Design a protein around this ligand. Structure first.
Ligand SMILES: O=P(O)(O)O[C@H]1[C@H](OP(=O)(O)O)[C@@H](OP(=O)(O)O)[C@H](OP(=O)(O)O)[C@@H](OP(=O)(O)O)[C@H]1OP(=O)(O)O
Ligand SMILES: [Mg+2]
Ligand SMILES: [Zn+2]
Ligand SMILES: [Zn+2]
Ligand SMILES: [Zn+2]
Ligand SMILES: [Zn+2]
Lengths: 146, 136, 142, 55, 194, 141, 58, 87
């Protein structure tokens, strides 16, 4: 494996595709489209469950940035996963009860002319606000809580 | 057309002009155009050559591919052909009745000198000698 | 990177952190400096050169200098301050000055050969200067 | 045959953030850049103009 | 990255065709920037492979933008989960996909069924109607099983779109079947030949 | 064959049938149409499961190779085409006649394929190499 | 004179579409009907009566 | 022997055909100018790695007339039956 910064630099430099130095890559960028349904599928399959704030995934990516595939298959120990979602059920019901007013977010979340974010600049070092997690009681749950 | 082609006299013309050693300098490398501008920050590392390009007046620079392959207006071909036409060769005298050939560079007298047989057993391949004379 | 490991840094961390924070400062510049006036290869080379240093620093601190224990060294590998796949090479006899990983790889070359920069660069040629395409390494065997 | 290597300017103390090398090497004597002087420039200077006069 | 990549790929196909009078916005709506003539309409109409890819990328942007809004810290944990739940059932609306895939409506109905399944049990008790049911995972899965089947279909369709675009259209001689309309005139040719 | 009784009618073709062969090695029946289609019929379901597409006008003979899994069909368009009856792949086109073909017969030894044509020639074909090497021109018609 | 509504006085010949013997030319487009079918052969059983079994019987 | 010969050629073809749908060479060069002192060369072939993303390289719907027929076979008829006035 090799430094995560490399795909940032490649994707950042190529990204406009007006770059005419990169124009030779344009041919490969088009052909990658054939796989793009497969890249979407692997991305959404991996998506972080609501008790995770950040998930690090392994990706397989083309040396020109042409396409990024997520190489994980997300496996779970299903009694743990049913337990984890069972705690989300408890917590999500509690919040909907307690909130009084719950502001559902707007869709699309960004305007049609708003370009996608600079992630290394914008997202990378704003620290995430905490996820949905139940307060496990370390006396009753100490087999599991840590 | 080339596989069948028969004219041994034409083949032997080509063999003389062809040259007999491979020219690797034409094989080997490209020229450093940042060095032509004069600014090659790569300089010791460079791959490409750091030497004078061919001047743009020099028509040998111009040659396309198709002109070369089809063989029309090919500058290097014309240079070769002009020297081949310039190359000296015999044309016989205007006196039609002359049938005499001077021969020279036979080497010195002694064991290095060719015998009469060495002329007899070769030049009679071409035609009937009427008289033969040697001046050692 | 510390959020990724949940446990807090072990005892040594005050010693390495001033340096490790400077390597991050370098890497953010190298990610972002303009991609013009440099070859299509050259723009990537700062990323690998800083990555090599940062791993070499953590590696030298524990192995050469012993100034961090095991627990902080292994913490650095788990945090991903250190390229520990690459460090596994530096431990090897004959690779102890290696540049990146991609130059050892062989399978990504055309002819199935390691990169040129390996080639005991003393042996290679009388005068040949080299900057291999993967990371600009001039020769990493001696 | 039947029966020195050029010296390098090494800074390989890994803590020296902004200065280090340890397989990145310019030699104690090296040309990083090479250029024609002015006489060789003036020969090449006319060449690019002669290419542009074709237009 | 996958959205940048997906955006650039479709945007490059537009430029490859040289349809510079179309604009693909960052939410993957394909708008025509001017009134097309006739010939620009004939040239630009290109839907089934391209739009189903484009709409799957639209869905992906809705999902990833929800996570982005969370990571910025302007949508907390619960509003993301309700966002993700909403996106998967209500994707029938936000999916322009329904048009091209129209068998896809099977999945829209099945997420509607799951929504009723979850909401009824989730609301049961002192819990009000309206937003907040963040239990996205049952609906999420339905779209992954959709994407399983569509992945080879679109890979084949996009391979045919890309290949004819690079290779050119080879239809200048393949055999044509003889279905309804052609049957009546085709009987005389084979009769007259016989 | 003995009673003369009728016991199927198979309604898949579109305009006319005129080729039938029953395979001597598979439970399949092949048929060719003036509707430009060659069909494979499966004599374990009586449904159709293969179509061989490439003929440009009416099929009018077909033969089923006695030992390979290979099928050959004649049509107007003045060719015979060779098919692989497993994959539907077409892997010869015996162009070389100049007028509509309608007879083909196959045999295991060379010439594996023999074709007869309204150009008043018979041709003998090298089924491996796909070339012809006879033209038996002696017919006037 | 009308003549563009011609009958087939001069029919075209096969062996010249995509890939017909050209097969390196064959092209990467192939999608709809060709792709998926019947990849395993059904050989007829022994005892189809025909050449050797019929002689075997009277 | 005939049936086995027929399949074995097309089989090797079909595998490359669906794909369409160390190893060395010793080269003896008739051009005797040669590599230094060597009447032959021995040379390593490797295959260019196909980029699995790159789309088809070239336009191939180029179309040209049918190749000329193989030279005519003699026509070999019996002599014309003349049937002139009444038929
Ligand atoms: O999708 P939500 O935002 O969770 O809203 C739903 C949805 O409302 P809308 O589709 O009108 O936006 C239901 O409708 P269906 O999608 O199931 O058709 C609706 O049911 P009604 O059709 O009866 O209005 C129901 O409201 P209700 O609880 O009154 O059934 C309400 O569900 P929640 O109130 O629990 O969100
Ligand atoms: Mg119609
Ligand atoms: Zn240079
Ligand atoms: Zn190296
Ligand atoms: Zn390296
Ligand atoms: Zn290297």
């Amino acid at each position: 494996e090799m430094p995560p910064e490399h795909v940032r630099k490649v994707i950042r430099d190529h990204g406009d595709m007006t770059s005419r130095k990169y124009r030779h890559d344009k041919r490969v960028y088009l052909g990658a489209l054939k796989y793009m349904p497969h890249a979407v599928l692997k991305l959404l399959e991996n998506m972080p469950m609501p008790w995770e704030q950040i998930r690090d995934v392994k990706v397989l990516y083309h040396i020109t940035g042409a396409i990024t595939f997520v190489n994980d298959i997300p496996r779970v120990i299903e009694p743990v996963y049913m337990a984890q979602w069972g705690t989300m059920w408890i917590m999500m019901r509690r919040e909907k009860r307690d909130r009084r007013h719950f502001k559902r977010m707007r869709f699309p979340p960004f305007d049609d002319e708003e370009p996608p974010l600079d992630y290394a600049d914008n997202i990378l070092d704003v620290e995430p606000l905490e996820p949905i997690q139940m307060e496990l009681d370390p006396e009753e749950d100490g087999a599991v809580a840590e | 057309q080339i596989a069948n082609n028969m004219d041994q006299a034409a083949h032997d013309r080509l063999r003389r002009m062809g040259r007999t050693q491979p020219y690797y300098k034409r094989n080997a490398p490209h020229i450093c155009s940042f060095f032509v501008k004069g600014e090659c920050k790569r300089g010791e590392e460079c791959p490409y050559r750091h030497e004078k390009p061919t001047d743009p007046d020099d028509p040998l620079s111009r040659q396309n591919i198709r002109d070369r392959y089809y063989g029309t207006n090919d500058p290097v071909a014309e240079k070769i052909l002009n020297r081949a036409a310039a190359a000296p060769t015999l044309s016989p005298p205007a006196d039609t009745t002359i049938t005499t050939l001077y021969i020279g560079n036979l080497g010195p007298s002694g064991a290095q000198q060719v015998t009469e047989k060495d002329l007899n057993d070769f030049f009679y391949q071409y035609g009937d000698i009427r008289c033969l004379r040697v001046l050692t | 990177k510390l959020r990724r490991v949940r446990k807090s840094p072990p005892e040594g961390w005050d010693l390495i952190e001033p340096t490790l924070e400077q390597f991050e400062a370098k890497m953010r510049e190298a990610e972002t400096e303009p991609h013009e006036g440099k070859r299509k290869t050259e723009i990537n080379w700062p990323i690998f050169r800083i990555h090599h240093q940062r791993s070499r620093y953590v590696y030298d601190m524990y192995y050469k200098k012993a100034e961090i224990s095991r627990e902080l060294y292994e913490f650095c590998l788990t945090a991903k301050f250190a390229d520990a796949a690459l460090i596994a090479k530096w431990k090897k006899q004959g690779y102890e000055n290696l540049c990146c990983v991609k130059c050892v790889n062989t399978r990504d070359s055309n002819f199935g050969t390691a990169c040129i920069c390996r080639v005991p660069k003393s042996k290679l040629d009388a005068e040949r200067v080299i900057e291999c395409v993967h990371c600009g390494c001039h020769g990493c065997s001696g | 045959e039947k029966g020195e290597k050029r010296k390098r300017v090494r800074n390989d103390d890994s803590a020296d953030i902004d200065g280090y090398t340890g397989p990145w090497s310019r030699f104690i004597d090296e040309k990083t850049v090479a250029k024609p002087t002015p006489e060789l420039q003036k020969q090449m200077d006319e060449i690019v103009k002669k290419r542009q006069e074709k237009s | 990255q996958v959205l940048r990549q997906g955006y650039n790929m479709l945007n490059l196909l537009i430029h490859r065709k040289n349809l510079n009078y179309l604009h693909l916005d960052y939410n993957f709506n394909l708008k025509p920037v001017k009134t097309l003539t006739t010939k620009e309409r004939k040239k630009s109409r290109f839907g089934n492979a391209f739009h189903l890819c484009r709409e799957i990328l639209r869905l992906t942007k809705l999902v990833v933008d929800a996570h982005v809004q969370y990571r910025l810290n302007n949508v907390d944990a619960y509003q993301l989960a309700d966002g993700l739940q909403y996106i998967f059932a209500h994707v029938g609306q936000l999916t322009g996909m329904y048009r091209y895939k129209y068998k896809l409506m099977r999945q829209v109905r099945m997420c509607k069924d799951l929504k009723h399944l979850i909401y009824y049990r989730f609301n049961t008790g002192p819990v009000g109607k309206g937003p907040g049911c963040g239990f996205w995972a049952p609906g999420w899965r339905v779209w992954l099983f959709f994407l399983r089947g569509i992945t080879p279909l679109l890979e084949r369709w996009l391979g045919n779109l890309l290949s004819r675009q690079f290779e050119g259209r080879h239809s200048k001689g393949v055999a044509k079947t003889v279905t309804k309309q052609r049957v009546e005139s085709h009987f005389d040719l084979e009769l007259r030949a016989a | 064959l003995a009673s003369g009784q009728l016991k199927l009618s198979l309604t898949g073709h579109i305009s006319s049938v005129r080729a039938v062969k029953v395979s001597p090695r598979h439970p399949f029946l092949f048929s060719g149409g003036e509707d430009k289609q060659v069909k494979c019929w499966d004599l374990e379901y009586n449904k159709v499961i293969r179509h061989y597409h490439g003929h440009l006008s009416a099929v009018q003979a077909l033969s089923v190779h006695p030992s390979l899994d290979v099928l050959v069909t004649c049509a107007r368009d003045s060719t015979a085409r060779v098919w692989d009856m497993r994959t539907k792949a077409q892997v010869h086109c015996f162009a070389g006649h100049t007028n509509t073909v309608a007879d083909v017969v196959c045999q295991s030894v060379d010439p594996q394929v023999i074709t007869a044509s309204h150009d008043a020639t018979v041709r003998l074909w090298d089924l491996a190499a796909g070339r012809s090497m006879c033209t038996l021109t002696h017919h006037k018609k | 004179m009308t003549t563009a509504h011609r009958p087939t006085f001069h029919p075209a010949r096969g062996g010249t579409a995509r890939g017909e013997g050209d097969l390196s030319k064959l092209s990467n487009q192939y999608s709809s009907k060709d792709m998926p079918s019947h990849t395993k052969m059904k050989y007829r059983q022994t005892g189809q009566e025909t050449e050797a079994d019929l002689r075997k019987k009277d | 022997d005939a049936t086995e010969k027929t399949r074995m050629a097309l089989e090797k073809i079909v595998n490359s055909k669906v794909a369409s749908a160390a190893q060395y060479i010793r080269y003896t060069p008739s051009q005797q100018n040669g590599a230094a002192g060597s009447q032959q060369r021995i040379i390593r072939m490797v295959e260019e790695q196909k980029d699995p993303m790159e789309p088809p390289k070239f336009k191939i719907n180029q179309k040209i007339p049918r190749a000329p027929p193989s030279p005519p076979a003699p026509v070999m008829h019996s002599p014309p039956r003349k049937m002139t006035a009444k038929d």
